[PDB]
Symmetry: D2
Subunit: 326 residues, 4 copies
């Protein structure tokens, strides 16, 4: 059977709580072996090898776990047939996107999580992990970029996002849809992201021990500009705006950001709106402010890309081209 | 025909562009009489009295337009049979939630906007105004709280949210659905919000010239606690966190807010996630920290209720009671 | 603890497959006791009594089980504090509606299924059933009509429909939304169906042993009139048309029906389209044809309402009014 | 500018109604010339040549218009740069899919319709047509198969379906997402159907004057088997089943289909469930019966593929492999 490596980072899939009929739980109560031994069917589909990379709740995911993860996938790619990275649901969409642009290993790279902790009744973790391996083991998964497999669905790392705070069906690719659906151990892939991923990108965190500082500001009515200023005073390399509607900023936040952009800070306009592209050629003249419109990339994902882009360039027109290709 | 007061605030609906086939536009280029003079069919269903309250794009909505609108409607309630607020789409969902709680008139109060400026080919403002007037003039709409009428659909101001950055069908009550749908100038109503609104709320802004300071901090991987710390230094009365997953906070952010709470800063846990409730009984001990769980209230809606909750109390336990009633 | 009656009809929830990782299966493999006894946590929230009414797959569901369930729930309303009906997922939305119009018991009546067989990994039935009891046991679930509890969501029996062929989250009230969400054994209800249900309807099946014959014919390009002709030829009482777009019929189908209507057959124009209403005032002159527009009711739900109206009247306009209130 | 040929078939796009605020209307009240002239900006992006193929409501679409339509794009492929087919929205997803399997012209073939009649307020027709021409004129649209452009979204003819009976944003590719989004005249493609279309299909209707006889039967509780027998007695070559749940059939329907299959009749199992695949390896042993699982092809789309499969083979297995490829 395929040799599949399971890089365990923690999350709800490893979390347990008081009971099955109680929602309480804490992340990372089990290790990579227990997860695997708990799903002995894995043994009929892949020759599994587990490794605990970290054991955090993804709310605490950070650049170091990211660098570490990419370096690890790239370094052991040549050694295994595919990967499964067990992770919490909270920031999984951010990590999947980050690996999607820094992982040069085009062998199946699947991320999997669980909305219910391992202790719950009808826990989703087992079958999720089982299905995740079904995907990391399918040859047709190679070259699709880094994937997220949840709820019998194979989702591309760039478009996948967490849609609902508790639903087991929460992961969906909200703008462009899923790449495929799994049924009875089989996947019918009918799509692949056209954006450039993995080996077709220039991002190389192999020698990177740290990613550039990129923060996120929220826009809403009567939005304060303290947050944006706080990030600017601390010298952030970039700031992404979780803007209102089609990428718009509260006037005072727009002020701080325009000052920022004109004095060096990379500034990306994204939106707090869940679906749709933050387009240019709407109300904002990005060209005039040196702002970059983020496309279908939501705030946290636009931060992933800006950080990597900032590793190569500081120019708004350059970053924009990157946001237009990746 | 019934008397409907149209309180104009600006927005795309009252905005234009140099082209009908180009996406660029500037808001607030149109006057209420012009918006109203453009939809002469209005005269066949209502005796319309337009008054331009302000002219801004809703990205610039602030507490004063809220105070103004709240009071204006409250004062003029007996002088008219309903209201229609022409508002930008960016923050229409926050303004509707604020009016929903501060307005004491149970006559149909309907908000309306446009995703396409007045100039665009197939501009949606026209029929949206017709339909919003159809709604404010339907006696069945009374007592349903502040409504948002968009795309032939009547939505409650609490649950209604902008779902897509550009789609005309963007406004959706993502958790509980719409109250009704408009076909041929008639509305089939099959739902009404159960959370207490309008006359049933304890919020009286009639004497208020200002609302408490409530900022929103965003959560993502490697999140900077700078924004949160800036909000606490500025003396913010409350901080709504747009957390990850089910209201979870990044380590540093959590720490800053957990401390802010210990010193009286009301802290609400919301979610960057689009649908679902940031529940209590998951991974955060709201009780140990003095945090309130926002429920289905997204960051920006949670901020509306917090400011108002903050007009009534500072006690997290009571604020939490507020977040469960309204 | 509430005394809850579990009337089991069979379906996937009490079905089984040879494997936890194979999608294959057969319905009606488990009895009610085995079923109930497999979620021993049930006895901690309720005093469950189970009764097998039938043990079929809902694909073969039919008039007699509907009448049997209806009589049984009505006869027994007095002995218990609420009901849970385990049912297959295929036609659960039809029975839910049927019982929503014929059950005069206003104590909680909850339907439940499982998309995965009891034998599968991360099988959904157990928590589904647990949550179905948490609902039938909530006093707040009373007077909401018949409900369907699936995926942590309470959905009114009228609007709820099977949205996906295999997704555990398939069940959704597509037009108006869920009534409430279940988190940690508690339900935050924010809605209730506005149409007349249960004790507010004039349908009494208590003395009925059969229900008027109502068939559904599908419309599509190059639609055959043969199926509609067969229904008319067999002397059907009502024919629901699953039309194209806004209730439209293909010419030879529109023909058989305009005539059938002319000769005393009730004809409801519904739609193959999954959401939205088949309205009056589009392209078809219901008046001229004596056609009843189904409203937001999908073909099969329209069948449920037409059979029951057909027990009261044969008059197109009386029927249309029934379609406008139930 | 590109030479785009507009072939008209009628539909709401060319339908007028007595009022711009009355939902009432009739299709086929405008001609291609008028349609084209109505949106004169078309002239700024293409050299439009209108050709009125037919003038009907798509609820009346048939094999003949489909054969003619395929034959016309095929023959005139060399004389133009792209094709935009105006069409009624009712059976649009059907024609879109017919042409997707029979058209060998890989130059942009784009279908467009409108939900609001031309005479209406905020008519969608104008900009839909404009955007459809943008699409047909973008060389990026070549090779994606036949497209459907509605509500600023480029959708593939295979997965596209009418989701709401009245919403202008009703067209969605429910299972795999849209190919791209149009903003300010530019399309951001991020996907293309992986299933085989146009020239990669062995379907050729160039010499065909009639398609095989395939009808659809509906399944619901107590489903009559009359409609299925009607089609059988009439010698239908194929029977698509709009089944309950995962392609399941009401007992008596099952029997008629099973027996008809045994006598050569091709029986394809689809589902009335709007999204998801009708799979094999569930409750029905397709092989044992000579039935074909339709996959994600809804009943009407599966009727398209079956008629075509039926022009090549009559063998269940060959027909099944066709359903796994096209």
């Amino acid at each position: 059977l395929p040799n599949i490596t399971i890089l365990a980072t923690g999350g709800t899939i490893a979390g347990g709580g008081d009971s099955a009929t109680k929602s309480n739980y804490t992340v990372g109560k089990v290790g990579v072996e227990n997860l695997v031994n708990a799903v002995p069917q894995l043994k009929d589909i892949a020759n599994v090898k587990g490794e605990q990379v970290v054991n955090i709740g993804s709310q605490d995911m950070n650049d170091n776990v990211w660098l570490t993860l990419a370096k690890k996938i790239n370094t052991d790619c040549d050694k295994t047939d595919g990967f499964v990275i067990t992770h919490g649901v909270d920031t999984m969409e951010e990590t999947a996107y980050f690996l999607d642009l820094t992982v040069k290993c085009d062998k199946p790279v699947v991320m999997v999580g669980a909305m219910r902790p391992s202790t719950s009744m009808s826990a989703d973790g087992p079958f999720n992990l089982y299905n995740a391996v079904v995907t990391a083991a399918d040859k047709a998964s190679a070259n699709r970029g880094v994937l997220v497999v949840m709820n019998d669905t194979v989702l591309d790392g760039r478009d996948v996002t967490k849609t609902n705070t508790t639903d087991v069906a929460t992961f969906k690719s909200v703008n462009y849809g899923p790449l495929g659906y799994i049924h009875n151990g089989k996947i019918d892939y009918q799509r692949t992201p056209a954006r450039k991923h993995t080996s077709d990108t220039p991002f190389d965190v192999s020698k990177l021990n740290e990613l550039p500082k990129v923060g996120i500001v929220y826009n809403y009515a009567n939005a304060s500009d303290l947050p944006a200023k706080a990030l600017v005073d601390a010298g952030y390399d970039g700031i992404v705006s979780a803007g209102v509607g089609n990428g718009n900023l509260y006037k005072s936040v727009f002020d701080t950001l325009a000052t920022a952009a004109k004095t060096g800070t990379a500034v990306v306009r994204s939106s707090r709106v869940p679906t749709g592209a933050t387009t240019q050629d709407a109300e904002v003249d990005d060209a005039k402010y040196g702002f970059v419109a983020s496309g279908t990339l939501n705030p946290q994902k636009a931060r992933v890309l800006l950080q990597l882009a900032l590793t190569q360039t500081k120019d708004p027109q350059q970053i924009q081209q990157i946001f237009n290709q990746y």
